[PDB]
Symmetry: C3
Subunit: 295 residues, 3 copies
């Protein structure tokens, strides 16, 4: 796009603050930012806050979100749809024009691990170019396995295609399929959808821990067969809803936009790959690593 040539807007931190016992303000940007998705390969991504997937958002079940989008894009409108919320899409998920802001308010009344993404037509173009992320809604009553979990991380799967190519987006296999991790607590990694960072800087854990991953497959196009090598999921909550409780799964099927909370024990020191078991995607970049040490 001519107005995007040479544009690379520095990442802006997410802003969020609680404004009542059940209300939270959230302010994100829409911005065009170079991301290295594979070694030597820069995708000039359409992003929230300069990250793809965008920044993690976490609220409590029953929170109403007062959401502000500041469109830094010089020429393309953007918008936001959170899958967490009940809202009127033709009122509340509408476009914010270049160099403008818009504020929308809506409730998050269901617990889980929800995709969010731009809702601007063509939505496929916006998601593929990098406008996706996850919002976690914490159940008012937690999960029944909460006492057993020792450590937690968030992982997101997404695809990357040929650069802003709608033909490829609709009809082509993905060029890369990738994991990223978004921070829940200080010290957690916070990375972008690329083929390498979570291999070279693996997630960390300690021998014997029960790990929880909040996961979502944001697509745009592919389903995910989520698997952690060398373990079996003790407990899985589809879409992160506590009611949806499965046990002893080797692999979790995730639709496009599909989330889960999975929990597994790592019993031995060493490095545990984390994959989509659709191995063409795994080979095209969708392998993270978890390093488990006596530390």
């Amino acid at each position: 796009i001519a107005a995007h040539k040479g544009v690379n807007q520095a990442p802006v931190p997410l802003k969020m603050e609680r404004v009542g016992p059940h209300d939270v303000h959230i302010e994100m940007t829409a911005q065009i930012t170079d991301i290295e998705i594979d070694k030597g390969k820069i995708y000039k991504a359409w992003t929230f806050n300069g990250q793809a997937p965008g920044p993690l958002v976490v609220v409590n079940e029953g929170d109403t979100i007062h959401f502000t989008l500041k469109n830094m894009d010089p020429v393309v409108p953007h918008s936001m749809d959170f899958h967490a919320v009940h809202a009127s899409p033709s009122k509340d998920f509408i476009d914010v024009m270049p160099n403008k802001s818009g504020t929308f308010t809506y409730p998050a009344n269901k617990p889980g691990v929800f995709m969010y993404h731009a809702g601007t037509k063509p939505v496929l173009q916006h998601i593929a170019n990098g406008m996706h992320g996850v919002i976690i809604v914490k159940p008012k009553n937690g999960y029944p396995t909460d006492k057993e979990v020792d450590r937690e991380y968030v992982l997101i799967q997404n695809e990357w295609y040929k650069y802003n190519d709608m033909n490829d987006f609709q009809n082509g296999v993905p060029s890369y399929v990738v994991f990223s991790s978004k921070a829940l607590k200080p010290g957690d990694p916070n990375t972008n959808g690329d083929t390498f960072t979570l291999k070279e800087k693996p997630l960390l854990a300690k021998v014997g821990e029960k790990i929880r991953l909040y996961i979502n497959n944001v697509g745009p196009n592919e389903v995910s067969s989520f698997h952690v090598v060398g373990t079996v999921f003790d407990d899985v909550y589809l879409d992160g809803n506590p009611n949806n409780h499965l046990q002893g799964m080797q692999t979790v099927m995730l639709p496009a936009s599909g989330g889960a909370v999975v929990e597994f024990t790592v019993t031995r020191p060493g490095t545990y790959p984390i994959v989509t078991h659709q191995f063409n995607h795994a080979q095209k970049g969708a392998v993270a690593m978890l390093k488990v040490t006596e530390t």
Copy 2:
């Protein structure tokens, strides 16, 4: 096919009548009928009753169906397989030759939302060319959320490929992916798998209602990531069996031939898109709309 050149047989209405407290007669045709699947694009479909997907069939759990197929096709045999039924496929799902009729009888002893389709080899050819549809079997004891539902519709997803091209059917991406809606009660829309009708004439509902959709992904080839923008499914029954009960899902994973009953509340006036969240398919036509008014 030479005998299909210029053939466009007018749609014939489904016939069905109850003949006992647990027996129902059903009579459908197999016919070759031009359907506009996208603006300007006519697919000379292989159809039941001149619709693709075919007409909706609804029976009660425990009903035995006495099924008659009248093959109006001048040259191609057709047949019918209902996924609802227990039957001998090599006896009961057999071909009916051109210009002949055949009657088969079999029980529907499980509740849910079942695909039906032609069972004539190559089955891929018959389904892709348009020989698919849904039969709903109503649970003897309803669903536990029945009292909460205010309005119901049926939606079906299917793909369309290059015209009667077996190479494309087996190896090619779909050209279109589409929703249609089939009527449950007088006044309900009854449409065909196309890219536009449910956008231009959206399904209707009223602010605050709990909506139930009986859905099925008939394929032939793709899985579906079913999602309704601006809401979360309060309750989902996999394959429409009341036992298979999930809560608070943002998106429902549907295999090829996969069904569900999903229920969600629309809280605000406006237009709610309904998608497969595999966005390449959504962009190739698989977006329906639900218009929610203070009416």
Copy 3:
């Protein structure tokens, strides 16, 4: 590969023996063996024991497996990952060099129907070339429907691509998609992933029986929409874990590496096709038959 030219190593039988009330020894080979995947089409497969998928392994919940791999391949390293086990992947799923042996030990503490496969990079290459199979872990307390089942078989789905072509493995549609059956008890068929054997020598059953299938979709790349024509699954246990219990499903969604125990009644004599309902795959070979006789 030059060292594989003209190599066709005769299948070697699986070896397994119990060595304690909760310990079992297992010894498999890695070997290069010509398999006919379709009529006239020989794939020089990378295999365990000369079968693709490899031989069936069955242990009891709580068994520790002492596993030996003898690499007969003249030049390629191989390894083994069982999805059943808790293990350190970077210690326990490591390569065995040509003409060497390696022994690894790890527990199987969860019941179900688990994929196993080579864990040697690129893992996609190893699985696609034929290094996959299933290990069943029998629940300590069986399934709640055990008393109702009259007959059991194992079925595995896998794909075959152009011969050792990593580009095709990653980016290409499968050339064949196939079922095979592995023996649970003397007299059961034991076959390889091909387009024809289970059509020409169908599985056998008797009118009125409840059949259980232990199934797994090993991929490498595709999800499976598993369906048995002319019946509905009475009971399904996702991943073969008794807790994960669904009822009355027409079709079961299986991710890549995904397993299940499904149970269905055949009510009438005749031949029942067994498919992935993603019909492009079915047309490319993924149809088995079950012949049901008054015998």
